[PDB]
Each structure stands twice: as C-alpha cells, then as structure tokens.
Design an enzyme around this catalytic site. Structure first.
Site, PDB file in Angstrom:
ATOM      1  N   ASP A   1       0.848  -1.199   0.000  1.00 28.55           N
ATOM      2  CA  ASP A   1       0.000   0.000   0.000  1.00 28.55           C
ATOM      3  C   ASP A   1       0.888   1.257   0.000  1.00 28.55           C
ATOM      4  OD1 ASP A   1      -1.869   2.088   0.525  1.00 28.55           O
ATOM      5  OD2 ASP A   1      -3.212   0.647   1.507  1.00 28.55           O
TER       6      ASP A   1
ATOM      7  N   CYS B   1      -7.391   0.215  -6.924  1.00 30.18           N
ATOM      8  CA  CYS B   1      -6.620  -0.161  -5.753  1.00 30.18           C
ATOM      9  C   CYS B   1      -7.555   0.276  -4.637  1.00 30.18           C
ATOM     10  CB  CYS B   1      -5.238   0.522  -5.692  1.00 30.18           C
ATOM     11  SG  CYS B   1      -5.123   2.314  -5.716  1.00 30.18           S
TER      12      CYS B   1
ATOM     13  N   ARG C   1      -1.490   3.197  -6.977  1.00 30.38           N
ATOM     14  CA  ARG C   1      -1.000   2.030  -7.685  1.00 30.38           C
ATOM     15  C   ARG C   1      -1.647   1.923  -9.062  1.00 30.38           C
ATOM     16  NH1 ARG C   1      -1.434  -1.995  -2.511  1.00 30.38           N
ATOM     17  NH2 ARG C   1      -3.255  -0.607  -2.163  1.00 30.38           N
ATOM     18  N   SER C   2      -2.944   2.236  -9.143  1.00 30.93           N
ATOM     19  CA  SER C   2      -3.699   2.193 -10.404  1.00 30.93           C
ATOM     20  C   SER C   2      -3.090   3.182 -11.391  1.00 30.93           C
ATOM     21  CB  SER C   2      -5.169   2.564 -10.173  1.00 30.93           C
ATOM     22  OG  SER C   2      -5.736   1.824  -9.105  1.00 30.93           O
TER      23      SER C   2
ATOM     24  N   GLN D   1       0.664   8.554  -6.084  1.00 31.16           N
ATOM     25  CA  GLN D   1       0.677   9.169  -4.760  1.00 31.16           C
ATOM     26  C   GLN D   1       2.010   9.469  -4.090  1.00 31.16           C
ATOM     27  OE1 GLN D   1      -2.409  10.020  -2.420  1.00 31.16           O
ATOM     28  NE2 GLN D   1      -2.394  10.694  -4.567  1.00 31.16           N
TER      29      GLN D   1
HETATM   30  C1  LIG Z   1      -0.293  12.886  -3.454  1.00 33.38           C
HETATM   31  O1  LIG Z   1      -1.492  13.685  -3.561  1.00 33.38           O
HETATM   32  C2  LIG Z   1      -1.908  14.051  -4.786  1.00 33.38           C
HETATM   33  O2  LIG Z   1      -1.329  13.746  -5.811  1.00 33.38           O
HETATM   34  C3  LIG Z   1      -3.156  14.874  -4.830  1.00 33.38           C
HETATM   35  C4  LIG Z   1      -3.086  16.193  -5.408  1.00 33.38           C
HETATM   36  O3  LIG Z   1      -1.916  16.739  -5.928  1.00 33.38           O
HETATM   37  C5  LIG Z   1      -4.246  17.011  -5.477  1.00 33.38           C
HETATM   38  C6  LIG Z   1      -5.489  16.553  -4.980  1.00 33.38           C
HETATM   39  C7  LIG Z   1      -5.585  15.260  -4.403  1.00 33.38           C
HETATM   40  C8  LIG Z   1      -4.434  14.388  -4.307  1.00 33.38           C
HETATM   41  O4  LIG Z   1      -4.507  13.074  -3.726  1.00 33.38           O
HETATM   42  C9  LIG Z   1      -5.555  12.807  -2.805  1.00 33.38           C
HETATM   43  C10 LIG Z   1      -5.429  11.388  -2.323  1.00 33.38           C
HETATM   44  C11 LIG Z   1      -5.850  10.970  -1.094  1.00 33.38           C
HETATM   45  C12 LIG Z   1      -5.737   9.576  -0.572  1.00 33.38           C
HETATM   46  C13 LIG Z   1      -6.228   9.292   0.730  1.00 33.38           C
HETATM   47  C14 LIG Z   1      -6.147   7.982   1.261  1.00 33.38           C
HETATM   48  C15 LIG Z   1      -5.565   6.953   0.477  1.00 33.38           C
HETATM   49  F1  LIG Z   1      -5.512   5.728   1.020  1.00 33.38           F
HETATM   50  C16 LIG Z   1      -5.056   7.208  -0.837  1.00 33.38           C
HETATM   51  C17 LIG Z   1      -4.426   6.186  -1.737  1.00 33.38           C
HETATM   52  C18 LIG Z   1      -4.212   4.876  -1.475  1.00 33.38           C
HETATM   53  C19 LIG Z   1      -3.584   4.325  -2.671  1.00 33.38           C
HETATM   54  C20 LIG Z   1      -3.155   2.872  -2.843  1.00 33.38           C
HETATM   55  O5  LIG Z   1      -3.939   1.971  -2.575  1.00 33.38           O
HETATM   56  O6  LIG Z   1      -1.877   2.683  -3.307  1.00 33.38           O
HETATM   57  N1  LIG Z   1      -3.462   5.336  -3.571  1.00 33.38           N
HETATM   58  O7  LIG Z   1      -3.984   6.520  -3.007  1.00 33.38           O
HETATM   59  C21 LIG Z   1      -5.158   8.532  -1.336  1.00 33.38           C
END
Ligand SMILES: COC(=O)c1c(O)cccc1OC/C=C/c1ccc(F)c(-c2cc(C(=O)O)no2)c1
Length: 298
Positions: free
Chosen positions: A180, A214, A220-221, A261
């Site tokens: 994760d 994911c 990951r997606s 992420q």
């Molecule tokens: C890094 O942040 C960003 O790129 C971003 C941005 O620039 C602008 C607006 C929103 C953004 O992300 C919100 C995600 C929240 C967020 C909150 C809880 C999570 F478990 C995950 C998650 C889990 C996984 C996985 O399973 O690998 N991928 O993402 C993402």
C-alpha cells in the site's frame, strides 16, 4: 532521454521535488456530484473523488453516481476507467459499471486487507459453488476458475444481466504483492503482470475500457496505467525519445486527481517504462526474463 533524466534526477536526489512539481501543475476540476450529501456513503475517501467532467455515470435513474473516472488517452488510443475499491454498499454499482461500460478486464492492485485494515470489499466470488447476486443492480457474478501464481492471480468470472439473461466473461487480474502506497518488488514482476493483462485482450479497443483499481484508485492504479500508456506511445512510433512521462502523467491527471501518490511510485514508473522499452524496441526475449525474475511459480 528518460534514462538521462532518470540518472539526472537520481544523481541529485530530486524526486521529491520533481514529484511535488507535478502536483503543483496537476489539473483541478469540480467534483460537485461526488460531494453531494446523498453520495456521502458512496465514497471510500473524503479526499478522493472523480471530476464531474470525466466521471462514469451509472445507467440508472435513481442515483447515477459512482466514484470512478474514465481516463481517456487520446494520443495513445487507450482508455482506462479508474475506480476506488467497492464499498459494502457499492458492489452492485461496481458491476453495473463494468457491464454498461462493456469492460472485459478488471485489474485489482491491492489485497482486501492491508496494514491490518479493510481496504476493499470482497466484491467477487471466491468459490465456484457460491456465486453472488447483486440485488440492487440485478446482476449475478460466478467464479468460473482461477489461476493462482506466486504474486498475482487471474480469475475468470461470468457476469450475467438477470434482466436479459445475457452473460459476459470477465477476467480478474489480482496483484497480491504491491505494498500500500508502496512500489512493486521489481519492474520485472510488475511488467510481467502488465503484459499478462495485455495478452488477455482486456486492454484491446474492441472492448470497453479496462477497470483498474486499488484502495482509492489513484496511486497504484495510476502507476499501472502510466506505464501502459508510455509503453504504448513509445510503441506507436518506435521512438523512446519522444515519450515525456511527466507530460503523460499530467495528461492523465486531467481525468482523475492525484494519480501516483508518492515520488517513489513516480520513480518506479520511470523504471518500468525504461525496462519495458527493451521489449517494445525489438528484444522479444526480455519478456521471458521477466517471467523468470518474477518467480510466479508456487
Ligand atoms: C499525493 O497527492 C496528490 O497527488 C493529490 C493532489 O496533488 C491534489 C489533490 C488530491 C491528491 O490526492 C488525494 C489522495 C488521497 C488519498 C487518501 C487515502 C488513500 F488511502 C489514498 C491512496 C491509497 C492508494 C493505494 O492503494 O496505493 N493510492 O492513493 C489517497
């Protein structure tokens, strides 16, 4: 060129910077529908929503909402529908989408439980004798068979439209070894997996968009789809040099927020693409080397 830039970025440890830069330029669109009070329980994460302009609408008259975006890569002629992991109450919605969108494949990049927490509902049947019937969307899903490998499993499902008794074979690609917020073990295993999905026809244009997910459907997606598109463009013109991976990730971010992420996922994305190019450019033998290095045998 991406290799140069890679060493360049590694040489001066500036991935965290390169990554925050992409975040600074990422598109930002309204998510009014997803934020409507009535859809509060249809979202797994408060901070993860589909833009209004690219959300997949369910074909029902009640509530057409579902946390899913259609990433349409115009230049590469490939579409992906990225979505969150179905919640206990949205599993019917999830299969409605798959059916209406005419998807052939579903790519799961997470395990139901990660870090000791429930990251996704058990939305598909685990035993042939115990099929599932989604009463709200009037659909039936049966497990036809599954080919378990060391780090991933491929399931053949049969989706049936109880209203018309129509049936469809749905291939389920489940990556069980991607931590994760983490990155694959080696680009080799990840690529072996990507090509498996490719070989299933699931990513072909003669089918609806492949549904990739994911827990939130962005990290990951995103990594998965980014490598697929990059390798695809590189393939269209047999010119690795004209593929700007960051420009391609930004294109995707117009359709769904926060794809990729962590700056390490971004670094892995580069690796997978650079490694994949070997195959795209004429070395068809590298595919077997990946299958070996991946150790997919139990
Ligand atoms: C890094 O942040 C960003 O790129 C971003 C941005 O620039 C602008 C607006 C929103 C953004 O992300 C919100 C995600 C929240 C967020 C909150 C809880 C999570 F478990 C995950 C998650 C889990 C996984 C996985 O399973 O690998 N991928 O993402 C993402």
């Amino acid at each position: 060129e991406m290799e140069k830039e890679f060493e360049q970025i590694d040489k001066s440890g500036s991935w965290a910077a390169i990554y925050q830069d992409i975040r600074h330029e990422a598109s930002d669109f309204p998510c009014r529908v997803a934020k409507l009070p009535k859809n509060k329980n249809r979202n797994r994460y408060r901070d993860v929503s589909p833009f209004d302009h690219s959300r997949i609408k369910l074909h029902q008259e009640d509530n057409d909402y579902i946390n899913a975006s259609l990433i349409k890569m115009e230049e590469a002629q490939r579409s992906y529908i990225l979505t969150q992991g179905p919640l206990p109450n949205t599993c019917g919605h999830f299969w409605e989408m798959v059916w209406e969108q005419k998807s052939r494949g579903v790519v799961m990049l997470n395990r139901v439980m990660e870090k000791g927490s429930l990251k996704c509902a058990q939305y598909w049947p685990q035993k042939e004798e115990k099929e599932m019937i989604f009463e709200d969307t009037n659909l039936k899903l049966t497990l036809i068979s599954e080919d378990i490998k060391s780090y991933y499993t491929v399931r053949q499902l049969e989706l049936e439209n109880l209203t018309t008794q129509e049936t469809r074979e749905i291939l389920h690609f489940h990556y069980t070894t991607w931590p994760d917020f983490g990155v694959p073990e080696s680009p080799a295993s990840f690529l072996n997996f990507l090509f498996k999905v490719r070989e299933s026809g699931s990513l072909s244009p003669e089918h609806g968009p492949v549904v990739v997910h994911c827990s939130a459907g962005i990290g990951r997606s995103g990594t998965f789809c980014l490598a697929d598109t990059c390798l695809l463009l590189m393939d269209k013109r047999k010119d690795p040099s004209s593929v700007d991976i960051k420009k391609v990730l930004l294109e995707m971010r117009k359709f769904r927020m926060g794809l990729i992420q962590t700056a390490d996922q971004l670094r892995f994305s580069y690796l997978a693409v650079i490694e994949g190019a070997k195959f795209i450019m004429g070395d068809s033998s590298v595919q077997d080397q990946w299958k070996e290095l991946s150790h997919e045998d139990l």
